Structure formats: C-alpha cells, structure tokens
From a paper:
From 2,034 micrographs, 2,493 particles were boxed and used for icosahedral reconstruction of the viral capsid to 4 Å, based on the 0.143 “gold-standard” Fourier shell correlation coefficient (FSC). Like other totiviruses, the TVV2 viral capsid exhibits a T = 2* icosahedral capsid shell and measures ∼430 Å across at its widest near the I5 vertices, down to ∼350 Å at its narrowest between the icosahedral 2-fold (I2) symmetry axes. The TVV2 capsid is composed of 60 IAUs, organized into 12 decameric units centered about the I5 vertices, enclosing the viral genome. Within these decamers, five CSP-As are seated nearest the I5 vertex, crowding out five CSP-Bs which sit partially intercalated between the flanking CSP-As while extending between 5-fold axes to contact CSP-Bs from two other decamers forming the icosahedral 3-fold (I3) symmetry axes. The CSP-pair, A1B1, represents a reasonable initial species formed within the cytosol, as it buries the greatest surface area between subunits (∼1,540 Å2). Additionally, the interface between the possible tetrameric intermediate, A1B1-A3B3 (∼2,525 Å2), is ∼56% larger than the alternative A1B1-A2B2 tetramer (1,619 Å2) and ∼80% larger than the A1B2-A4B3 tetramer (∼1,405 Å2), suggesting that the first may be more stable and therefore more abundant in the cytosol. The protruding loop from the floor of the dimerization domain (residues 610 to 620) appears rich in positively charged residues (R612, R617, K616, R619, and R620) and inserts into a negatively charged pocket between the carapace and dimerization domains of tetramer subunits. This insertion may act as an anchor to stabilize the association of the capsid decamers through electrostatic interactions, protecting the viral genome in place of more robust interlocking strategies. The interior capsid surface appears predominantly electronegative (red) with discrete electropositive regions (blue) including the protruding loop of the dimerization domain and residues along α1 nearer the I5 vertices. The TVV2 capsid displays similar T = 2* symmetry but does not exhibit comparable subunit interactions and instead seems to rely on the abutting interface between the CSP conformers.
Numbering used by the authors:
A (entry chain A), C (entry chain A): 37 to 700
B (entry chain B): 37 to 701
Amino acid sequence: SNPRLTKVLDEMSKKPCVNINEIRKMIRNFQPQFIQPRNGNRPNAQPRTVDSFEWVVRIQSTVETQLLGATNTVPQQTLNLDISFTDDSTTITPASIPGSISMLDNSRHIPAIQSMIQNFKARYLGSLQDTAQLQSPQYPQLLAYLFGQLIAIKDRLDLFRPSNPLSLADALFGFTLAQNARPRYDDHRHAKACQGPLVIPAATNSDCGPCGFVQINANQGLTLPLGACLFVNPETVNDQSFQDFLWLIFATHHRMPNQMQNNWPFSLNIVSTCAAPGRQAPHAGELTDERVRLALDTGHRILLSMFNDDEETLRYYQRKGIETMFRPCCFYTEGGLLRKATRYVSMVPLNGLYYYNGATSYVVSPIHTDAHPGITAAIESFVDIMVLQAVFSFSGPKVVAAKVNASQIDAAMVFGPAVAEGDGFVYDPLRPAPPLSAFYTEFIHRPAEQRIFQMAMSQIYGSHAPLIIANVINSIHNCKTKIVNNKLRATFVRRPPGAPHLKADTAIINRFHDPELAYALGILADGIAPLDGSHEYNVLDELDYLFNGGDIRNCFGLNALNTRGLGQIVHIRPKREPGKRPRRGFYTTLDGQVHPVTQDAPLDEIYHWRDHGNLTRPYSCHILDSQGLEFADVSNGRSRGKILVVVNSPLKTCAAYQGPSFAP
Amino acid sequence: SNPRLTKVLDEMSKKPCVNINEIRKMIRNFQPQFIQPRNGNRPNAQPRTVDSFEWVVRIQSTVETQLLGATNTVPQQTLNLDISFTDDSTTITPASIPGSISMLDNSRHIPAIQSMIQNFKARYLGSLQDTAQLQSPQYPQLLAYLFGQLIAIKDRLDLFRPSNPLSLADALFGFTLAQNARPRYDDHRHAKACQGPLVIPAATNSDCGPCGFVQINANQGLTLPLGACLFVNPETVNDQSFQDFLWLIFATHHRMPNQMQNNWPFSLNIVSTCAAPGRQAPHAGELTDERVRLALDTGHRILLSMFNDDEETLRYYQRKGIETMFRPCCFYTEGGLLRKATRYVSMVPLNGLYYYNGATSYVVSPIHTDAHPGITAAIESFVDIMVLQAVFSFSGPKVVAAKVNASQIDAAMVFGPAVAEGDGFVYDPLRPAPPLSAFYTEFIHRPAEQRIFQMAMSQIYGSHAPLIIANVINSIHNCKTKIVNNKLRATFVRRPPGAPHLKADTAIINRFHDPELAYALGILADGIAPLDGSHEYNVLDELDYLFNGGDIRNCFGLNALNTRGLGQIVHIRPKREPGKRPRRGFYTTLDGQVHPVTQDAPLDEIYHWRDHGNLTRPYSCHILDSQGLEFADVSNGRSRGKILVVVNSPLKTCAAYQGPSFAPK
Amino acid sequence: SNPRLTKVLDEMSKKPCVNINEIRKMIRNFQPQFIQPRNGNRPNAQPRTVDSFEWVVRIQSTVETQLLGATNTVPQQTLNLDISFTDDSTTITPASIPGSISMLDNSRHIPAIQSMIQNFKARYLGSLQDTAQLQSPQYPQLLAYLFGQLIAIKDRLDLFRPSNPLSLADALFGFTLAQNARPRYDDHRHAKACQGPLVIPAATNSDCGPCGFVQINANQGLTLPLGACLFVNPETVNDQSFQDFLWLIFATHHRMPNQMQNNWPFSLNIVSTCAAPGRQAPHAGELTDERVRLALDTGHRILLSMFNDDEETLRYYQRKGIETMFRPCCFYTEGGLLRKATRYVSMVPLNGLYYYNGATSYVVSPIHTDAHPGITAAIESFVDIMVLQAVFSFSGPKVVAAKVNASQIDAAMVFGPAVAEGDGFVYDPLRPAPPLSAFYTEFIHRPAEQRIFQMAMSQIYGSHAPLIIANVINSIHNCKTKIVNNKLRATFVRRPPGAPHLKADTAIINRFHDPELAYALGILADGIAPLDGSHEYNVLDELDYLFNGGDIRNCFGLNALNTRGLGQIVHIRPKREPGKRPRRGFYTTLDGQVHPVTQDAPLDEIYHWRDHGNLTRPYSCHILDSQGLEFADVSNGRSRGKILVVVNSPLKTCAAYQGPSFAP
C-alpha cells in the first residue's frame, strides 16, 4: 500500500545492484600510496615497534568542480577515505539468533572415514553416524577465524616496516621477549594481545605438533577424543608445511587475550596411521619466508577442504577474522556508530569430525595472495556499512538531541518538517547517554526497511546473503556502545580526552561516510544526487527547496557559489503577498534558534555555512523549517548557469553509476 | 526547430565526408622535403644530441591571386604547416567517463587457457573445471602506448640525423652514459625522461627476459601472479625475437618520468610449460637494426592477438602514444591552445589474461612500417583538431576579451553583431587568468555543436567513432591550461617567456589553423568560404556585408584591392535619409574606441586595415558594429569584375573539394 | 540458400565416399620398387649410415594418351608420387581445442583392480573411484605414439639396408657409439635424435625393468605412485617378451630430443604380486629378431588392452607417431604448405590406472605386420591432405601475391574474374612473408567449407571422424610456417639455399598433389574433370572457356595438341562484331602483363605454355581475363576429334571412380 516503497523496489528490480565479485576483483591488485599517521606526518625513520595507534593507509580521492561561463577557480577538495591500521578490537560474541550460525553438513566426510576405519581393521564402537550426530556436531567456524587473524597480523607487520624486522614467525612466537614485554607487532595502550613469550605444552607420548595425536592400529581399540578429529592420510602428517601451519595457528591462538583462551579452547586431534611424529616446536629462526608461504598455502587447502569446498563462507569468516586489525574509519564528527554496531559474528566452540586425503577444488585467487589482504577485507566491510547506511537513511536523517527540558514536552518538539516526524529522539542530559542499541533495534525491524535491506543484500551477495543478514541483525541487536555527546574532530582514530561538545548536542546516527563512494562502487545509494557530470542549476528554486528541510548536499548551485557569489545574485525579503497583517518571516536552525528576517538583505548576511567546495556534510540538517520568505535575484539573468564536476576516485568499479537510487 | 541545424545536417548527408583511409593513403608514403629549426636556419652539421626543442619539419603551400584592373601585382603568401617533432608532453590521465575506456572481452582467451591449465598441473591441487574464476579485468591498453612511444623514438632519431649515430637499441638503453645525464636523444630543457643508464632488474630463479615467469608442471606449484598473464606455448617463449621485443618494451617503459612510472607499473609476466629461459640483458652491441625490426614485427603480432584482432583501437592507442613527441604546431599568434585541451587518453593499469598461439589475421600496412610514422600520427591528429575547430566556430568567433574592473559574478557581455549572445565573455586582467575549461565544456554540450560533431566523426571513422568522441570530451573536462596575454610570434614552439602582448588584449579561442587545409583534406569546414578558382565579387555589397558584422576573409573582393587602389573606388558617407533628421554615423572596432565619420571621404583613411594579400585572420572580428553608412560608388563599374586565386598544396587528398560545409553562398 | 553448396551436398549424399577400410586393405601388401634418392640415383653400394636426407620410395604411376584418327605419338608422362623417407620433423604440440583430445573412460578397469586389491587383502586408503577421478585421469595417448615411432624406426632401417646392419636393437641402444656420435639410423644435418649411447637409470630396490615396480602385500599398506599404474597378473611380469617390449619403449623415449624429455616424462609403474624381477638391461647383442618380434606383439596386445579395446584410436595415434619419419611429398613448385599445416596432434602427459589380465580381442591385421608400416601410415595422411585440398579448392585457386604497390590499392586489383573475388591476397615484399596460419584459419571457418568438410570426413571415417576433424582444425589453427617466396624445384626434399624466385611471385596455397590420385582412390575430388577414358573435345568452345579464367587442366583438346597442332587448326582474331570503334583485343596473364592482340595470328604465336602431355599443373591460373577475342578454325572440319587416356596407377582401389565431384 505504501507507494514510495513500491517505487523503490521496482527501481531496484529493474536496475540490479553490483555483484560483490567486481568489488573483489577491483581491489586484488591495489597498491597503497600513503601510510602517514592519521593526524600528523611520517617521521624520518620508522620506529622499531608498532606503538602509535594512529596510523592509517589513506586511499586518496580527489574531486574538483568548475563554474561554466565564469572566471572563478574553486580549490579542489579531497575524499579522505581512511582505513585504521594499528588498533585492536573484538568481533566475537557467543549470542546467536536462529539463522545466525549454521551447521555445515557432514555428508561427504562420515562415509570416507567409515571406509578408512573398516579398511585398517580398527575396532570401533557404534555406527559413526549417530555418534557424530550427538557426540560431536560439525562447526569448523573457529579454525577459519584464527587463519584470518594470522593473515591480518602478517599484513599489518608488512605495511609498517619497523626499521629492523625479523620474520612473520619471529615477531609472533615472541623469541627474546621480557616476561612483561608485549609482542613486537602490537605494543601500545589498550592492546588486545597476551604478552610475553608463548609457552609450548609439555611433550607427552603421542603428538602431531601442538595438538594431540591418535593412531589407528589394526585389531586394536580406537576411541576418539573430545574435540575435533581431522583424519589425514599418512603422506601428509610427515610433511613439514602441514606441521608448520599447525604451529602457526597454535601460536596465533595463544596470543589472543587471556580470557578468550578459556572460552574458545583450540582443541584439535590429528588421527592417522603413521607413527606419532612428536612435537618439534620451532625455537630459533627456522621458519623462512618461503617455508611460511608454503605453510599458509597448505593450511588454506586444508581449511577449504573442511568447509565442504565452499570458499564463500570460508572467505566470509576469514575476512571477519581480519577486521580485528584493519577497520574502515568514519568521515564525520560524531562517527564510530555504524561500524561499532555491525562487527560481531555469532560463534560456537570448534568440534566435529573431518577427512582430508587430497584437495579437490583449486581456488584461483585466495584472500591471502592479494596485494594486501587487510585492504581487501576492510573494503568488503565498508560495502556492508554503506548498504546499511543506505537503508537507514530512507525516511530522513534520524537525529538524536540532548534537551534539558526533555520530560516536559514530547518528541517532535524541535524538529520541524525536515526530520520526518517519528525519527527524532531526545533525552535529558542529567542521565547518562542512552544505548545506541535501543534506537537501532527499533530502526531495523520496521517492515519498510526490512523488505528493502533483504533485497539489497540478496542482490549483492546471492545465495550466501542470509547468513550475512542474520549476522548483522544479531550484531546490531547486540551492541554495548553509548551515544556519547563528545566529538571526534575527524583528525584522530580514538576519541581523545577533553574533546569539545558536538554541534548543538545533536548526534546524527545514520552517517558513516559520503555516499559518493557508494555511487562509485555501484551499490545502493541513499537519497542524495550523485555529483558526477554536467549539472544545470537554478538557484531560486534550488534555494527554495532547501528552506523546506531538504539537504544542502542536493543543492549544487549554492555550494558552488557559497563564497563566490550569493551576495550579489540573490536577496531575501519577507513575503508581502496578501493584504493581511505583515509578518516577520523567520526560519529555525537545528538547535531551535528561531531567526527573524525583518529587512531584506543579501543572502550571505542572513545565513552562513562553511565552504567545503561541493563536498558538504550530507545530512547536516541545516534548516529545520521556515515560513514567510521570498527570494528575488538581482543579477541580469546569470543566476541559472551550468557547472561541471569530476570525481576521479581510484576505487571506481565496472558498474560506475548503474546502481539504484531514490532521487534520480 | 532550428533551420540552420537541419540545413547543415541535410548538407552533410548530401556530401559525405572523406573517411580517414584516404588521409592515410595520401600521407603514408612521402618523405619530408626539408627539416629546420622553427626560428632560424639549420647549422652545417647536426649536433651530437637533439637539444633544441624547436626543430620542425614544414610543408610549404602557397596562394597566388591574379586579376586585371589593379595598379600593381599582388605578392604571394606562404601557408605552411609545421610539426613539432622534438618537444615532449604528457598524454595519459587517470580520469574517465562512460565511453572513455572500455574493457575487451576474454571470450576466446579463456577456453584455451583453462584447457591448458587443467592438464599440465600437479594432480594434487584439485581439478579446476570452473571457467568462472578466470575473470580478471581485460585492459591491454598500456602495452600499445609503450609500443607507440618506442616507434616515436625510432622515428625521431631517423628524422634528425645526428652527427655521430648510435644503434637505436644502444641509444635507448644508454650503456655508455654518465651518472645522471640525459639519454642520447631527448636532451634539452623541457625533456622529461628518466636519466642515467638503464638498470636491468635482478638475477632471480624464474626469469624470462625483463618480466616474471611461472611454470605449470607436476613437481611444482601454480599461483597466478597479480598483474597480467600472457599464456604462450613453449615454442615461442624459447624464440629469440620475442625475447628482444620484451626487452625493448621494458626499456622504453623505464624512461618515463619517475612519478608516472610509479603510477603505472610494468606488471607483465609470462606463464608457459617449459623451463624458464634466463634473462639475456643485452648490452654493448647485441641488438642491431634488423634484429630490432624483427622484434618490432613480432611484438606487433603479439599486440594484435591481445586486442581480439581489432586493429582499429590498437592503431588508436598506438597513435596516441606516438603523439607525445610529434604534434602539429599552431599557426596563429594567439598561442595555439586548442590542441593542448584535446590530447588526453584515459588509462588504467594493465591487467587480464592473454593467450597467444598464432596470428589469426594479417594487416597489409601496420602503422609501425610506413616511412616515418611520426608524421602520419601528427596529421592523423590534425585531421581531428580541424573538425573540432569547425564545430566550435559553427556559431561565431567566440572571443574572450579583457576589461578592467569586470564584475566577478558574471562574465557575459554582448559585443554586437557577429558574436552571438552565448559567447563573447570578458575577464579582469590583473587577476589570474581563467581556466579555459569553463568555456569549451559549455560549448560542446549544446545540441547544435554536438550532433554535428557526432555525425562528422561518424563519417570520418565509422564504427569506431564513439571511443574517439567520448575520449576527446573527457580531455576537455579536465584541462588545466589557461589563457595568457602573450604571443607565439609564428616562429616559436612555446611562448617566449618575455613580454609579448596582444594587439587588442583579446583572444579568439576557436581558431587553430587556417581552414584552407580543412577544405583541401575534404574534412568539414565552416564559416570561411573556399578560395580556389574564379569568383564574382561586388565590393559595393560585400563591404556592406562587412560592416554589419562580417569578417574580411569571406570578403575576398576587398583584400585583392586593399591597397592596390581601393581608395578611389568607393566612398563612405554618413547617410542621406530624405525626411526626419540628418544624423551622423560611426563604427566600433574590436577595441572600445568609436571614432566617427561625418562627411564623404575615400575609404582608405577611415578604416585602413593591414594587407596580408588573400589570407587574412578568419575570426579577428575587425568591426563589431556600425550604424548609418551608405558606401556610394565613385566609378562606373570598376567594382563588379572577376578574380582568380590558385592554391597548390602538397597534401591535396583524393576527394579535396567534395566535402561538406555551410559557408554563405 | 546457397545453390552450389546444396547441389554438392546432394551429390555427396547420393554417391557415398569410399570407406577408409578399402584404402587400408589395398596397401597392406604393397611391394615398393624404387628406393632411389629424390634427386640423383642410387650409388653402387649402400652407405654404412643414413646420412643423405634426400631418399624417397617412389610409387611410380604412368599415364599416356592417344589422338584417335591421327598419326601423332604423344610421349607417356609419369605421376611421380614421392614418399619422404629419411627426414625428421615434430607432430606433437600441447595445445588443444575442446574436441581435440578425449579421455578414455576407465569404466572396465577400476572394478577389476578393486576386486584384485580386495582379494589380496591389501590395505588401501579411500574408495578408488574418486581417487582415480581426481588424482589421476586416464590418458594413455603417449604410450601409443612411442610405439608408432619405434615401428617407424624399424621400417626406415629396414628399407635402407646400410651395407652391414646390426639389429633393430643394436642400432637403437647405441652400443659402441662415441659420446658425440649420432645413432646409426639417424645421422645427418638437423636430425631430431639425441646422440650418444643411452644410459640406464640406476638399479634401485624394486624394478620391473626400466620403470618402477610396486608389489601388493597381504595385510600391508599400499600407496600408488604419481604416474600411471599398470596392474598385471604375476604370470606376465616374469615373461621375457613383456620386459623386452618395456625396454624397447624406454629406449625409444630416451632418444627423442633432449627438450621433450622434460615435458613428456615416460612415467610408468608396474604393480603385481610377484617378487620384483629387477632390471636386466640388455647390454650385448641379445635381442634377436624373433625375440623382438615377440616383444612387439605382446606390446601391441597390452596397448590395445589399455585403449578399452578400440583399435581405431590406437591405430590413429600409432600412425600419427610414424609421420615423424615417413611423410607424403608435394608435386608442385611452391609445396610444403598443406602437410606442414596438418600434422600436429594435441596431447596430455601420460597418467591414470590400467588393468591387463589377458587379451580379449584378436586384431587380425595390426599395423606393425603390414608389408611396410611406413607406407601404410603415409598413405592415410595423404588421404587426409587430399580431402583437405578438395574442400579448400571449392571456390577458386586462392592465390597469394607479392606486389610492391600493395598499400596503394586494395585487393582484386590484379586478379580478374578467374580468382573468385574474395580469395586473392597481396602483401608488399618490404615486410617479411606473412604467416600461412592467418590465411588458412580464415579459409577453414567459413560455413560453406565447414559444412562440407565435416560430411566428407564423417563419410570417410565414421564414428571416429570427430577426433580427426577437431585435431586437424587445431593443427591448421596452430602453425608457424611462413609463405616464403622462394621455390623448391620439385627435385629435392628440403628447400635448397639459393633457389630462384617463384613464378610471378604468386604462391598458390591450395595445391598439394594432382587430383587424379584422389579420383583413383575414390575420395572427394575438387572441380577437375577425371582424365580416365574416351573424351570428345571441341577445341573452339573449349578454348573459349579457358579465356574466361577456367583451368587449362579441364581442357583436354588443347593439352593434347599443345605442340602437335594449334598452329594450323585454330587462329585468333579481334572481334569486329558491331559498327562501333574497333578495339585491340587483349588478355591478361597472372602477373598483370596486359597482352594486346592486334593482327590475327596462329594461336601458338600469341600464347605459349610448356607441354606436360596431359598432366598440367591443375590450378596454374594461366589467363586471368580477356576481352574482345574471336577464335576461328582453318582446318577442313578435323578440329573436333576424339582422344583416349589410360591411367594405370598401382594404387587403384575398389571404388575406382565412384567418388563424388563438382563438375561431372
């Protein structure tokens, strides 16, 4: 029955959204150019240890406009797309909704191991089907997350050359570290890595490395352990690469903080027909780069085999393991609201039965072979948040304010027609800041946003979308972040103490980054026009639409002339239309400051705003409402000019501007 | 609803423009007659290294007018075309628009590559059998651009034969160089080329000339690297010429400016099924003329196979690459800028999967073997700049003038007849000059200077039209060039950074070279009418057409007699209105002054314009306005005779005077 | 819609082409008569080593005509069908199109070996089906190619008795050869055989000869090697013939050039229940002819067993192995264009599982028992090239010329109506000669030629045609030969340095040999009449048809009288038909030499051409065009005589002249 939603769904159906594969393909070979700290500049020589948690790899992107039929030269602006580079956070949470985490079927694994046991004349108890079903289900999720974390550590330590590196393994096993010193790759305030050299478990009778080992003997009882069992052919257990991979995972799991080493035990047990090779813990430098590369390759082979040869869920989990190191930064004052609310992945302890006799599918382009896995992982997350922003900002800007007299009056007290009546919330500042979860949970579950978010995600991903939708719904439904009134200043990574209060104390909780990036990527874009090419503005009507609550970002003429004209091109005067009592026209800004307009004056003397060229804050919600105003031009018919805009971003993809929208 | 537009479209339909094949046929095979520095005379013997960035081959072409009735004979003029031939310039930009650059389709590279990677690949990495992960982007552009640059080097060395020669390979690599000295060629103030001797990269395990190498065998591993992969049979990889071609391409890629080198890395790397042939790294005198030529041939075959055997876009990118070192030189003192804003080709770092087994086609005459490709590329560019000229001028001269204390809100003042309302801007001089992309873009979007461009380019090039069109539009959008108060003096390559000054402080921004060449080549030409044969001229009316906002060039009845005795032929008097009021008349020149005329007087001392002969500035706007004039005759007849003009130029194409145009009848 | 093609298809359907079996049957017992060198004559005593790479076994065939009602005696001509005899080339290339190489199904092999392993209580890992599918597919192609090469070596060394032979094995194992000397059977410039005595691999623990050996033990682990596994019953591993055959193949594989010994490794592993017999490398003369014959027989038995008992694909590959020694020579000046472009066979490395407990099908007439396998192999190739020529010359002679002013003018510049407009190509001589592949690739893929070539091949071969069609399309699509302007002189085998330029510099790229052979064999013949029996010529109309571009080879009267009349039987005069201005009739030869005919003269004084009796070059393209000419006879009605022609070739088959054609 809703017309607007039907129109949007029809348009989305007619113009399909860009498949994820293009976005993956267009980043596999991207060479970063800037590794400066977010705030300052790179010092002469790199430090010896990753300490300043402010570094960022900057994907520069430039936009400059021109006023056709004029001699004005607007300075070029800069779409600063920042990727956090040294900062640790957690993306694991044991809390799932029904579709959040699935159970990979053990259809092709049980028969093979059954036949193996029968062939080697091992006396087992009970048909393996029911014992598999009840004793040990099949959740290999964890072992991919650790792999992603390892790749992320490698990438981080690679980009930031710490002036005398050792190896992937020498900075990971903590050789020559004081009992209180932190690992080289992660040494700064509020890190998330256990400190000191990691300690190998004691050498027991039978060991295939850092995990237990059980061999199957002809005419001999066989009993499985309690964790996960990975049957392998004897040709592999004696391989160097396999054991090196196993050791690397073990090391990565004993470095994550102490308290998650007792909730997600890294339990595994290799089973085969060899003689227990025993653990051979590498001690001195003996894991050269080529050996580590082989280890990673064999490891990915085993992982892909465990996932029923899916390579899509595996890629998703491997990525979700990486954001723990690489995150996409915000581009607004009150940021860290969307990313902080969509990061968690529901998980279950690792257990079940596996079988690997030989690889079957040859993944051409795995994650770990990309030019820089961190960037590739971060960009996919950026896409997720972009779509989420698109769905959220479907019916307004969703403001939240801190008015002291909050109880005395209800909502819609201050926000005129601009903020859709129903999306403005307030809270008195006497109490602590509310929980963002409260607002977002109510936002997501409305039918209008649900029925569109589902379609968008399905178009982007496909058969594998439902996992992502369920997981994001869970995460947003489970977030502890508060809407703190402070500001971020957009020149840091973590909120600095003593920062000033927000603008008008009104946080806006849709924005995460400019929609021009979404347009370029070819993904769903919110109701903002794409500043792409030639435009034909008309300052009068354009300006009039602004004072009805519209976003200034949709007004090209004003932004172009913000300080080069508009003091000699347009005037503002009260409306004298009827014969009734004359009234002083007034307009209300965001903070409820009713502004009167008595004597007609040049526009620049009535309203002001900073000139960011043509990249202004999208949803700034400048003018809530205005009544009784007229706009007359005082230039001899040169207020309807044309402008040109060029956006040569380096992350443009095939579907340049073919993505859907709301206001084409 | 535009009579002019429909008339021009119908005309262009009537007389189709000459497709480029005639231009190529004409220009392909003549050697230059004489090459000299633009300003001065060539020395006795050429120096060691090309070091003055003015040498330009020129192409003489003259006009002689002839008629009886004048006092003395008219001296002839020399309309000659020049080619820069030494100076360097960038041509590659990262910006893009929809049609600016397209990705080819790997519909005939995937079958073979998959069937060759499925068999010869250790039987423990699993069977691939998906033919869907092999979908990397196909952008084999930069290879052609580098190929073009290499051809340009060869041609530039050949034309300006230096005193002590060196093998093209030796000059390119530059073994016997200094620490940071310029290459043997391209050694002057504006030169932009990585100095120093070229450095071979490294001594790795898997080498196959300059680029990386990966093999696919049982006792090995396979991992396709990230850049481009050129899958070839073991037969050719062990060949000789192919290795030399790879070395040559690498060599020319490392002479680009260091920053641009970093932007677009040479990421080629080959994969095959045989042992890696170690890099050879030729030095001292390994490569020689014939071996280089053979390598060029095989390289062209490779590139053609990479392009899906298109050969029309291949030639396009090759031309654009060779254009960084050859280009037409402007002819008007204005400063020659129309070219500077049309020279950019969008690009993206090379990538994709390529398979090469055979030829699949044979092209009778590829660009790289046509007797100095530089000249043919330059003229192939000129034949497009002229079309752009024709389309812009479709309305009027489109002047841009300078006035002090101009309103910094709008810059559109009406100048009078002969200058339509849209054009004719103005700008304060004492502030930095405008950007000159704030006018062209506004020009080429209107649906009158767009459809004409569309159909003209369509007729010139045919199916492969859009690409050129799209690309040129992009060039206009982002061009940093600016209008300047200086002159080229007609004997320079760049403005002498001194104090040349404009005669009228204005600039006409839509003229690049005389339309006579456009007529001769058969391409579209506008406005100015052609002058090659007998003509009936009526001074008494042609002059009238002049003072109401014309240009002298159309008025070949005046230039003939400009100072041959036009004086005692026609008088100008204010007006003889037999009724209301005897007011006086005046005219306004391109400057502001409005000096008036009161009584009958000979014309020679009321206007008194400079006499070049029968080749005057076509868009100079000699007079803007005039009201109240009569132009009485002062001799029975003697103002209704005949005139014959002969112009012979060496580039007369096949269909020379059978092209479309819309000049006044 | 095309009428000519429909007519040809209808005629082909109505008159089936000759089955290949007749051609095979009519050569099994052919005794060659001439073994002279191509150019000169046999020396008194044969040399001691095969050095002159010019020898050829000549299949003489004679044709002589007679002029009924005349006293003239035309000398008999000679259809010199030459078979190259000592020259090495390569017919292997790792490049395949989709249908080029198939994968023989292992349907009847896996179950037998499965049952064997189960019976002998060997502990194997994993069901053998999937391991066969992924670990090792079933491509036995190579092992047949080596067999063909071995047979070819035997035949070559047999025909050319080198004055003191040793044995098949003594000239193959290189006993008593200097470390730089070449093998006796192949010692000449640009050979293709590795030199010096071949070296046996070191004697390891278990060996069944020159290849690894693995025995299956009760209650003992069994792991397969990486190459091909050939399970055999124990009764055979201890046989002498089997091991001798294995040794012979090993020797033949280590003699092919060095660089193809690292791309096609001869990997094999015998598996059985015997005790490893160990390698017993024959060292001194100990392989007598009867022992070698038994070896060859048992070897063919094993091969046929490996090929799922097909004997057709096996025969094809065995033949394709032989052309590496025996090839069919050209019969024109600019030859070595068709054969050089249709020789390659797409291949994959040898691997998979096999099983041979006992032969099942008794091939009555294998290749190696023919009178001379080389000749039989060469003739089948000759048939392939003959059909290919037939399809190519379906719409003209396909000329290629070297005109200096090639760029200035387009094609069809010189070739009048004779050369079908669309089949003439030119290239300036400044650049090197073009690649023949470019022209042939475009020729083959036209629908008109494809739809006829497919039918012809299917009729000739049958169910096994698609392999041959796909393989020839691949080969022609992959050829490195250039159209070199030089000439061959038809009295050599390899182009001699310093040979003179071609006639008019115009190579014709359809001809490989006279079509009379194709007619005799009963295979598809191009648009040339078969000179078989009584003919009723009419010199006037016949001559007129010539000057419209037709082929002189279709004009019997002219050829018969080329030098015995035509100076007193027919005159040429300009046509004075209308009242318009008289014009000098002219005709244009191949090289664009416009020839004027002003005053009527005897024919022999206006045009000339060499007299080859009645065997003239078929597609010589004598007269491109002529306009304004008349032909009047000056003999009292004896210009319409009859002629008789007799063609008693020794390779006539059952379908003497029943094959299809174009101009019956």
